[PDB]
Each structure stands twice: as C-alpha cells, then as structure tokens.
Amino acid sequence: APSRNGMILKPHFHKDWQRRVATWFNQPARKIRRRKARQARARRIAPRPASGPLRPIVRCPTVRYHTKVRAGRGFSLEELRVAGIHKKVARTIGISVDPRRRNKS
Amino acid sequence: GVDIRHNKDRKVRRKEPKSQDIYLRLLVKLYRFLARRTNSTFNQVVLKRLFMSRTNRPPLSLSRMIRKMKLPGREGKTAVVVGTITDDVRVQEVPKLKVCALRVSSRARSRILKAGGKILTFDQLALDSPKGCGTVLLSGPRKGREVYRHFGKAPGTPHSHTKPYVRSKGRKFERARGRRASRGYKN
Amino acid sequence: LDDLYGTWRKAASLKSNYNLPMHKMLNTDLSRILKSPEIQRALRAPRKKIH
Amino acid sequence: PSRLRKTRKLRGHVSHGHGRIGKHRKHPGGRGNAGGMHHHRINFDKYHPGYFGKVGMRHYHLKRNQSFCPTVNLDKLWTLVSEQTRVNAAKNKTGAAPIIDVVRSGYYKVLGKGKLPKQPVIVKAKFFSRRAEEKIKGVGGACVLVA
RNA sequence: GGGAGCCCGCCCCCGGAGCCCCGCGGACGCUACGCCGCGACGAGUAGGAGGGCCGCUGCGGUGAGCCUUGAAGCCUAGGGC
RNA sequence: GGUAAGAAGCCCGGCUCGCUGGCGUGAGCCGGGCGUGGAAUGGAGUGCCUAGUGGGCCACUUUUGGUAAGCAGAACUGGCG
RNA sequence: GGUAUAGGGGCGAAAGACUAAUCGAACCAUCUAGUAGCUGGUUCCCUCCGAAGUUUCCCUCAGGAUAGCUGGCGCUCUCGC
RNA sequence: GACGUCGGCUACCCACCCGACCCGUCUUGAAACACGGACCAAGGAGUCUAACACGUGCGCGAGUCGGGGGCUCGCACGAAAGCCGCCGUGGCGCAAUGAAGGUGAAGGCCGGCGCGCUCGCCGGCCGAGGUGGGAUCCCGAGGCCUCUCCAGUCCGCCGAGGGCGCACCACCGGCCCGUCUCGCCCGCCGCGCCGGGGAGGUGGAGCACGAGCGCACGUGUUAGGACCCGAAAGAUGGUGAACU
RNA sequence: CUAAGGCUAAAUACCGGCACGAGACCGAUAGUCAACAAGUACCGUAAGGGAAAGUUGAAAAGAACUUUGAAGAGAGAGUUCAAGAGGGCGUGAAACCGUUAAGAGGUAAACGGGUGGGGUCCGCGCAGUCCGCCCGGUUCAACCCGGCGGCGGGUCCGGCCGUGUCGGCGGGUCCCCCGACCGGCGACCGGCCGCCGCCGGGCGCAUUUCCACCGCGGCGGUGCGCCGCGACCGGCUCCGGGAC
C-alpha cells in the first residue's frame, strides 16, 4: 500500500531467490588461487613474458568511444605478410594471430 | 485547575551540536562564552549556526562569496561563513579576500592564497575581532539541494511544478494519463 | 613517515593523491585564548551576585 | 544495531506499537502495487501522475552508444586545458589563441551556457550550438568541426 | 595642557588597600555533556519521542581487576540504596 | 455569517504603454513629505518524516420516522471513550 | 484360502453405501513456513507530548487510499539587555 | 536514663479503622451469567536481505566512489590491512525539453552603419536583473561624563538618522525545449518542399555563479516466510481388496 | 559470415564422497532427528512416521566388619577434604508434600493507606557526652655560609629555534645566506637577577616542635535514646478593646 508520496518500485523478488542466492565468501580464496596459478605459470615459462603473447593496436567500434585504443585479439594475416612473418611461426615466437580480422584503413 | 495547552510548551531549537568531534565542541565553548559575555549579536548568530546540522549550513561557492564581497560598502571586511568554502571553476578573476570558515576545499584554498588573500579559522577570528567588527556574514543556498525540488504541492495538482519520485525518467514511465491532454486529463 | 603521508605543503609522493587533513581550529588551547587581552578588552563585567 | 532500534522500547507494550483497535494484519491493502486503478487511485493520481497509459514510438533494438553525446558548456571550457595555457594567453603580443580539443577532454557537443572570458580560442568539437558559436565569434575565436 | 578656587610641596606601590569591591593573580563551585539562580506546569488508552550509573549474551580495549585463605549458581526471620 | 478599524496608508512631482480614449483614462514605473490608527489577552511564522484512527455512545437545546422505546437517524456545545 | 478390479479411480440388489476404527473423493511424502480484509498472543523502568471513529473514492460496508486529528526533527525572526 | 533497657522508616506474624469485585482481550460499554486461564520451571513471537523516501553523524567536494581485478604472505593475529598511468573503464551529479526527427540555457549600457523600423549589422564597457520584507555589518550628528573654567587628542556606552544589504518568502522581468498565431529579413559547395533569426500566449520534473558522491545510524513504505500460530482447499509422485 | 560434419584444457559450479583448517555461532527443552548401543527403541500391512536419554569421585579408595529383619531396608564402623558426592550419585531452585518453632482463626482467601503488639537478628553502651582547628595555664625554624634542584623575568644580553615580508635567482610546486622589521609565538640553551624548596654547617634556648592534663575560653559540624522551654518570622482559624 502506497503512503504519502513514495517512489513506485517493483522489486524482482517473486521467485525462489533465497535458493539461488550466490554468496561471495570465497572471493579472497579465489583471488589467492588465481595469484598462485599465475605465479606457477610464470615459473613454468621462465624466460617468456608473464602476460603472454603480444597484442595488436586496435580501435573501438560503437562511436560512443570511437577514440580509445585497446589491445586486439591478434595480429592480422595481412599485417604479418607485410612484416614478413609467417603466421604459423608467429604462434611459436609469441605473436597473437587471428584469421578473422580485416584491414580497411 | 488551569487551562494551558502543553502542546508546544517545549521548544525544539538545538542547544548543543549532535556531532561528537572535539574541535567543533571547543569552538562551541568559545563562542558560548563570547555570546554570553559580549553584547554583540554576531557571536550569538555564529553560535546558533555552529549548532546547526550539515544540511542547515550548505557550502558556499567561491563565485557567490566574490559577488557578495563585491557589493559597495564591504571593502576590507572579513567574510564569515559557518559552512565550507568550495572552489568555483567557472570564475577566473579572483580578488584577494579575508575568509573565515570551518573548512575550505583544497582548490579554493589554493585560489585564495594565490590571489593574495587570507584564510582564518574561528578561533583566529575571535582573537582578531571578538565582537565580529568588520565582518560580513555569508551562507550558502539553503534550498540548493535537489531534495527541496520534491517538496511543496504534490504532482498531479493544478499549478504544481514539483518533481515526482520516479525510478528513472523516460518515455514510458510518466507523461501519460494525468499529464497528457489526449489521455484522460492533465494538471 | 614523511614520505608516506607528507606535510601540509607537500604531496605524499607515495600515495598518489593525499594530503594531511586541515585543522578546524589552530589555537586549540582555549584557556590561553579566553584570558587574552584582545577578548577581555571587549567583555562585560560578569554577574556572580546570584539572588 | 538492535540496541539502538525501536523494538527494545516496545517490550511490555501489548500491541507493539501497531494499534489495538485494528491489528497489524498481514496484507490489508493488497500486495505490492495492487489496486492502481481501484482503492489506491487517489494516491496514484495525486502522487504519480502519468503512471497508466502508453505514449510515444517503440524502439526495438535501442543502443545508447549511437545516441551517446556528452555536452560541455562554455561556462566551464578553459577547465579542460591546463591553467598555464590560459596564462600564456592575452599575452606575447601575438594573438596565440590556443586550441582546446573538446573530444580529447571527453565531450562531443559544446553548449552556450555561461560567460566566456575575452580570450580567443580554437574550439574543436563534433557539434556546436548556435549560441555557443555566437559567443565564440564574439570573443574572437573560431569553431572547428571534427568527425 | 593652560588658568585658578570655597604660602609652597605631596594627593605614593596592594608581595600588601585589607576587603560588600580591588579592572595586579584569582573557587570550596570549573566530570563547562559541569555547576548555579528564578518563575510556570505535572491526568491519560491507541501512538510518538527522550533518558536509563536498568537487565542477558558474546567481541575489541581497559581495571599491575577478583578468585581453592573459595568463582558462578542457589537459599535467607539480616544491613541497605 | 462576511468585511474595515492605516506604513502593504495617504499627499504631491515626473516618466512608460503595441491597451482605451477628442482632449482624457486605467495600469505600471521612479523621487520626496507625513507614523503609536477601537477595548483586552497573547511571542509569531515556516518546511519536511509521520504512528494510530476512519464500528462510537451519552447529555441541555432544535428536530426527522415511529404510539412509544435504554429504538433508528440529524444540528451546536460538553463529557465517557 | 487363492485371485482380479486402486482414488476423480475401483466397486456398489443403489444406502453417496464400502475402499484397513476416515469416504459427497482413501493413506504417505513434497510443493508448504500455501493464503487469509478473520480469531488469539505480542516480553524492562521512568519522563514529555498525546488522539479518531469524520471528508471523498474503491464489487466499498469486519478493509484500504486520501484529507483531518498527533508526534518528532528543525529552521527564520522579535524581545525586560 | 542505662546490664535486660535503647533505635531499626524498611522486611516476619498478628489485631484494629477506612478503602478495596480477577487478570489479558474484542468492545461505546467487562467483575460479569463474554472468551483463555489448577500451579511451577525452561523456550517463546517486529528479525535478515534488496529497493526507496526523509532526518542525523563523518570524509571529500563539481566533483565523489571502490564494485571487479592486480601488486605485497607461507593466513597465528588475516580470509584482515596497505597500494594501484587500474584514480576511473563504470554508477550518481554537473542540462534540460520533445513521441521523434532534433534542439539545448544571458543579457544590459554606450558610439556608429541601414529610416533606430521596439528590426539587422559593426566596436567598447558592465557583466547573473529589479521591487518589498530581510538576521547581521558600516557611517553615524549628538548625548552621558570626568574634584573648578577653557582647550583638548584618546578608552568608551547609548545613539536619532543614513547605507551595503547573507540565507529565505511574495511578485515583476529575462533565458532553454515542445506547441499556436502574425509577420519581416538573412547564408551558401550544391539557390531547394534548404537552413537561421523576431514579437506575442502557452506546456516542462528546467537555467537564472553549483552541492553532489561514498559510509554509518534512526523512522516509515514495500518484495520476499516477513511479528508468532491457525484453515475449508489445489498440484506432483508413490502405498493399500489382512476390514469391506 | 559461409549453415545443414566433428575435436579441444583455462578462467566456471560443487548443501554428495575422502582428509583438513577456522569461527564476534548454540551449549543438552539450545546446536543436525541423532554429543549417549540414532535413523536406534517403537508405531503402521505399506509407502512412511520417529523419540526420550550427558555429568559420583583427583583416585573406586564403590562402604570391610558387628547387629535387627526372610528380604527390600536400616543402626553402628570405615574410605574420602567432601557420601551434607553412595552406582540415573556435581550444583539441587519453584510448584507440591511431611515434620519442628512462633502467631492467628465464626462474614472464602487475598490486597492498599495508618498505627499498635510479639519475635528474628542488626548498631549501640557497663555514659556515647563525637571530635577537628586557634588561644591561656626532644630539636630547630628566625638569620647567615656552602652545595643541589625548581619557577618567573627583561636589557633579546649571546647562540639556536621559529612565522610573515623584503634581498642573492643564490638550487608552477619544493631548498640555503647574511642584513632588517614585525608575531619572540610554552620551540630550545649559556650567563644575570629575584623568589622557592632540599641537604650539610653554624644558631642551646623568652624562639621551635612533639605527648599528656586543667580551661566546655573563640569557631565548625554534632547531640546514644526520650524530651521540655524561650525569643523571631511566614501561612492560617479566632478573641478582647477603643476610634471614624
């Protein structure tokens, strides 16, 4: 029942949400586990970079941003061909390669 | 056997600040002594404003303080603000001032000190002018909060321009029956 | 400690954007302030002749 | 804190602060927003006018990125650039008129709200308002369109 | 400062004038969230608010705390607030 | 049961009007001169959060239906609640 | 004695009779802490303030919403200065 | 008055006088021939999460934030704490108005050019308007004096009167967006079913030199079991012809 | 982009299973139904339903032996600090019951206000006249010498320190030098003065401090219990007069 100018709201608590409540008491343990796994991988690849393969320069769609530059999925085949790098050898050397990227500009 | 309505016999005005911080209480003691000794009403007003809550002493903007000090007559007078002085980014020329306030933002403090002004606390103001001579008392806009936009005559009433409580403004959340002339009525 | 928190006229240089909080009142000793000549020069004679 | 809560002061009171003529029943008025048209119409029409009924055109696949266009007023325009840029202005006896890139600062459209100081400046933005352009021309600058 | 009055000079400082006011320093009264002085009032269900140095349990600090020369608990025709 | 018992009022001087008019109105702007406007009592004004209640009853006076009712139903005031 | 018919089903020389002391829809478990505008109950003290059964709307008449009555938080000012 | 005498308001028992019907609840009305009630011990009913609204406290402040992640530890104390070109991707606020295409918050004074045409175009200046009420602050004639008459700078209190006028209220104007009416001119890469501008009404949750963000607490409203206990019912899946 | 073919760990979830760590959680009517021979006893033909139940003692040292009784049960004796812990045995409350002591009893019992009587012990006393200051009837303060420590002060005396400005541009924000003024700020020292305190020496007795008494002499709160009287005031109910 409304009472003297309250906001009209519709809580989405009509299902059995208490059975599907997801707690986060394992967040610090999960962070510790991820940190340990990352350190283990870094020790596994002793001279290789911890982050991993190189990522290309990529711009953003959705003109909302239109200016930000981020890391790409992988280097394009035309880029590899211009640089004189074989696509299969790039994977073994540590260059991220994806075969779906286009090159308009 | 006397007919006296005790409905409003107890005055609800504040007597001491509800804050438990010690510096404000020391200032309260100082201005209590100053108000109960000196004949100036400036000390009493300052004490009453110190008693006021956070919402009752809104921050004062640098531009508003500048425009209030630019009025003819209050030349070379110290500005007294019980709230906080906040920097205004849409003003370039800031003359030197003499500002007394509980707090000043870092940007406003830098602006005032770079302009050649002086900033004083309330104890320093009491030491300088115990009775508040040569002081201009200023305060921020009390009705500046968006809370007061929802107050007054309720919406859906003729000649009412009150912002209703809406979860999110949009096309299909309001401006329908009760607001559109083509749908039922409007106010 | 100074490099961790900084003084009032210098940034922390170990915390990206932090400075020490400002004092609401500087002369915290109100006993010294109350009996100062400046204040007592503008005070009425106290009434302690309670009837 | 239950210590500071009201329920501790209601110990010993029979009705527990909810009246005794009419008990605190479970749902007397209806659950949630029940009766928007019936038995709560007065409240829904005196506090939420325009709740019922449709208006406007539907837009199925709406994207906020297409209509994203932040705006900045001439009231706060030199704040986008460093203060030393404005210090090196109205000086040097050259008419430098520095360039302020609004898109770099994060806004697309420049609006005409506020007073602009008497200092020429080159404003680059995707969109300009007529009043903002008039203010810039009167100050002595130039509006530059970018894509 | 000058001119003078119903011969000139002092007419002095509280480390001491001694006090019903002493502006030279100031409680036995100052846990200033304290203390002190005047007036007016005190009904009450539903209901609201405030204060609890009222009570139970556990936690962070603190009583150089208590305790087999006797803890909690329980009983009491004892002394009490 | 509404009003009026003055400063938010009177007396002048000058401007504006795309309204109204033969000149004139009428309204709005600015400058100046004049203060206790009947009795008695009160310190006033303003903004939000807001529980409970929405079964009442009785009494002087007026009064509806009914023969009458510790009957049913109204008006002012006061009580119980 | 064996066997067949198992619950909106069986069976009934028909009584809504029988179906494991229950039959106008058996028993056990789960949904389920099903819903109730309806009963009942609702836990320490003191202090201050302190009500209504009335307005209008609702398939409304044992209930809600809305004004009204009420409490709290304040704030703006005047002064036995 | 002092070796069987004192004081013990309160609590043990008894007597007297007055008053005095059993508690809780529904109710206009309860001691009721209204309902629950032999007695005692233990348990026992307004909680928690989420979304809001208001008020209060704190920090920063046209900004605010830690959500998530990463860097330090083998976790006693720690699943804590510190830090981040992540400090802001992102949320809220700083801009609103239209269904939308879209548009989008400032003016005034002075000199000049067009016929000052309440209109347009060139330069300079002031730069959030005005009236009334406005706590406070400034000037303040003059008065009060001081052991004698005058002159007289100083410490004062009152101070008629005159002003700048915070916050806030009422009103008048001004500005932004949608819409209606009357109208005159501007621009060109494409001279068009182009774009822009004025005045007068009106609608808006708007501007008119800002006040928000994060945390905590209190109250109220809801969704959840939702202050506790309570149905007649409904559905799903299994077990019964040992009685009949 | 290339469907009607296929493979693939990683960041993801884990109220079951194995083994661990932790708690601002409950402490035997609580916490899982289950702290114990718990899905056990038991119930229903069956699907299924489902409990109650911890504590002697440090150590059984678990009461040898005599005696009454058929025995259960006692009376002695013994162990134990404790059986006033005796095998469902730690602490052992209330309802309820038996017994001892006191009091009372024809308007059911019980309750509030006011006293009185009797007991329980409590605090006095073998007078309680409670004291605490000033005054009368064995050494040192007074005064000097030496030492030590402390406080305050200015010529800022000299040096540090320290805030605002000026200067060397000497190294937007951050550092040194001499010179000057100001706030000389409780931010520190070396000398000087004044004062105070302590120790050690003089100071031998009209001073000094102790212990006790006869003064109830001056002051203050008080009396062990029961009381009585006087004067002043305030608030009341009255009485006797005279005079207009």
PDB file of C-alpha atoms (C1' of nucleotides) in Angstrom, chain H residues 50-149:
ATOM      1  C1'   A H  50      17.183  -5.849  -1.502  1.00  0.00           C
ATOM      2  C1'   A H  51      14.796  -1.146  -3.365  1.00  0.00           C
ATOM      3  C1'   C H  52      13.356   3.574  -1.876  1.00  0.00           C
ATOM      4  C1'   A H  53      11.956   8.418   0.964  1.00  0.00           C
ATOM      5  C1'   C H  54      13.254  11.694   4.932  1.00  0.00           C
ATOM      6  C1'   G H  55      16.470  13.242   9.114  1.00  0.00           C
ATOM      7  C1'   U H  56      21.269  12.910  11.637  1.00  0.00           C
ATOM      8  C1'   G H  57      26.892  11.998  12.041  1.00  0.00           C
ATOM      9  C1'   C H  58      31.769  11.758   9.091  1.00  0.00           C
ATOM     10  C1'   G H  59      35.141  12.250   4.736  1.00  0.00           C
ATOM     11  C1'   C H  60      35.978  14.668   0.010  1.00  0.00           C
ATOM     12  C1'   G H  61      33.866  18.423  -2.767  1.00  0.00           C
ATOM     13  C1'   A H  62      32.000  19.968  -9.148  1.00  0.00           C
ATOM     14  C1'   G H  63      33.301  16.535  -8.198  1.00  0.00           C
ATOM     15  C1'   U H  64      32.699  11.608  -5.332  1.00  0.00           C
ATOM     16  C1'   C H  65      33.241   6.250  -5.094  1.00  0.00           C
ATOM     17  C1'   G H  66      35.924   1.491  -4.578  1.00  0.00           C
ATOM     18  C1'   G H  67      32.348  -2.547  -7.463  1.00  0.00           C
ATOM     19  C1'   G H  68      35.573  -6.104 -10.022  1.00  0.00           C
ATOM     20  C1'   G H  69      40.882  -7.130 -10.958  1.00  0.00           C
ATOM     21  C1'   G H  70      46.155  -6.731  -9.953  1.00  0.00           C
ATOM     22  C1'   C H  71      50.922  -5.810  -6.679  1.00  0.00           C
ATOM     23  C1'   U H  72      52.614  -7.212  -1.077  1.00  0.00           C
ATOM     24  C1'   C H  73      52.239 -13.608   2.700  1.00  0.00           C
ATOM     25  C1'   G H  74      53.995 -19.232   3.969  1.00  0.00           C
ATOM     26  C1'   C H  75      46.514 -16.809   6.638  1.00  0.00           C
ATOM     27  C1'   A H  76      48.520 -17.168  14.091  1.00  0.00           C
ATOM     28  C1'   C H  77      46.853 -12.437  14.794  1.00  0.00           C
ATOM     29  C1'   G H  78      44.494 -12.279   8.263  1.00  0.00           C
ATOM     30  C1'   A H  79      40.334 -14.864   4.776  1.00  0.00           C
ATOM     31  C1'   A H  80      42.355  -8.623   7.914  1.00  0.00           C
ATOM     32  C1'   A H  81      45.373  -4.303   6.329  1.00  0.00           C
ATOM     33  C1'   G H  82      48.310  -1.066   2.549  1.00  0.00           C
ATOM     34  C1'   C H  83      48.877   0.448  -2.616  1.00  0.00           C
ATOM     35  C1'   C H  84      47.274   0.942  -7.877  1.00  0.00           C
ATOM     36  C1'   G H  85      49.328   5.615 -15.667  1.00  0.00           C
ATOM     37  C1'   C H  86      43.926   0.211 -12.865  1.00  0.00           C
ATOM     38  C1'   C H  87      42.105   7.060  -9.520  1.00  0.00           C
ATOM     39  C1'   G H  88      38.181   5.694 -13.293  1.00  0.00           C
ATOM     40  C1'   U H  89      36.562   1.804 -17.515  1.00  0.00           C
ATOM     41  C1'   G H  90      31.586   2.295 -14.852  1.00  0.00           C
ATOM     42  C1'   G H  91      27.442   4.401 -11.278  1.00  0.00           C
ATOM     43  C1'   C H  92      25.424   9.374  -9.346  1.00  0.00           C
ATOM     44  C1'   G H  93      25.694  14.527 -10.061  1.00  0.00           C
ATOM     45  C1'   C H  94      27.456  18.843 -13.302  1.00  0.00           C
ATOM     46  C1'   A H  95      21.366  20.071 -18.715  1.00  0.00           C
ATOM     47  C1'   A H  96      17.000  20.035 -19.793  1.00  0.00           C
ATOM     48  C1'   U H  97      12.920  19.707 -23.095  1.00  0.00           C
ATOM     49  C1'   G H  98      10.115  16.848 -27.305  1.00  0.00           C
ATOM     50  C1'   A H  99       6.678  10.696 -29.410  1.00  0.00           C
ATOM     51  C1'   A H 100      10.609  11.614 -32.643  1.00  0.00           C
ATOM     52  C1'   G H 101      13.477  13.660 -36.417  1.00  0.00           C
ATOM     53  C1'   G H 102      16.187  17.227 -33.005  1.00  0.00           C
ATOM     54  C1'   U H 103      17.295  21.397 -30.305  1.00  0.00           C
ATOM     55  C1'   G H 104      19.651  22.839 -26.000  1.00  0.00           C
ATOM     56  C1'   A H 105      20.002  27.774 -21.007  1.00  0.00           C
ATOM     57  C1'   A H 106      22.406  35.928 -20.798  1.00  0.00           C
ATOM     58  C1'   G H 107      21.947  39.720 -21.075  1.00  0.00           C
ATOM     59  C1'   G H 108      22.304  45.183 -20.361  1.00  0.00           C
ATOM     60  C1'   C H 109      24.604  50.193 -21.427  1.00  0.00           C
ATOM     61  C1'   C H 110      27.337  53.453 -24.746  1.00  0.00           C
ATOM     62  C1'   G H 111      29.251  55.132 -30.176  1.00  0.00           C
ATOM     63  C1'   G H 112      28.468  54.030 -35.394  1.00  0.00           C
ATOM     64  C1'   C H 113      26.276  51.794 -40.278  1.00  0.00           C
ATOM     65  C1'   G H 114      20.980  50.720 -42.601  1.00  0.00           C
ATOM     66  C1'   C H 115      14.933  55.169 -41.879  1.00  0.00           C
ATOM     67  C1'   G H 116      16.806  53.353 -34.582  1.00  0.00           C
ATOM     68  C1'   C H 117      11.960  50.492 -38.032  1.00  0.00           C
ATOM     69  C1'   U H 118      10.937  48.240 -30.263  1.00  0.00           C
ATOM     70  C1'   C H 119      14.387  45.012 -36.684  1.00  0.00           C
ATOM     71  C1'   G H 120      19.536  43.829 -38.675  1.00  0.00           C
ATOM     72  C1'   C H 121      24.950  44.660 -38.865  1.00  0.00           C
ATOM     73  C1'   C H 122      29.901  46.746 -36.764  1.00  0.00           C
ATOM     74  C1'   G H 123      33.480  48.299 -31.742  1.00  0.00           C
ATOM     75  C1'   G H 124      33.988  49.408 -26.416  1.00  0.00           C
ATOM     76  C1'   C H 125      32.278  48.886 -21.461  1.00  0.00           C
ATOM     77  C1'   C H 126      29.490  46.439 -17.092  1.00  0.00           C
ATOM     78  C1'   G H 127      28.900  41.813 -16.510  1.00  0.00           C
ATOM     79  C1'   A H 128      23.754  36.789 -13.389  1.00  0.00           C
ATOM     80  C1'   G H 129      18.445  41.808 -13.322  1.00  0.00           C
ATOM     81  C1'   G H 130      14.583  44.663 -10.367  1.00  0.00           C
ATOM     82  C1'   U H 131      10.777  45.843  -6.038  1.00  0.00           C
ATOM     83  C1'   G H 132       9.096  44.877  -0.939  1.00  0.00           C
ATOM     84  C1'   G H 133      10.262  42.340   3.853  1.00  0.00           C
ATOM     85  C1'   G H 134      15.215  40.847   5.270  1.00  0.00           C
ATOM     86  C1'   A H 135      19.290  38.195  10.885  1.00  0.00           C
ATOM     87  C1'   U H 136      23.983  40.554  10.830  1.00  0.00           C
ATOM     88  C1'   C H 137      27.941  44.542   9.272  1.00  0.00           C
ATOM     89  C1'   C H 138      29.394  50.168   8.013  1.00  0.00           C
ATOM     90  C1'   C H 139      28.881  55.555   8.595  1.00  0.00           C
ATOM     91  C1'   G H 140      26.826  57.925  12.329  1.00  0.00           C
ATOM     92  C1'   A H 141      25.060  64.094  14.007  1.00  0.00           C
ATOM     93  C1'   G H 142      24.561  64.225  19.178  1.00  0.00           C
ATOM     94  C1'   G H 143      24.265  62.924  24.317  1.00  0.00           C
ATOM     95  C1'   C H 144      26.236  60.678  29.020  1.00  0.00           C
ATOM     96  C1'   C H 145      30.690  62.259  31.727  1.00  0.00           C
ATOM     97  C1'   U H 146      35.399  63.135  34.433  1.00  0.00           C
ATOM     98  C1'   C H 147      37.005  67.047  42.206  1.00  0.00           C
ATOM     99  C1'   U H 148      36.597  74.264  39.277  1.00  0.00           C
ATOM    100  C1'   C H 149      36.836  77.423  33.779  1.00  0.00           C
TER     101        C H 149
END
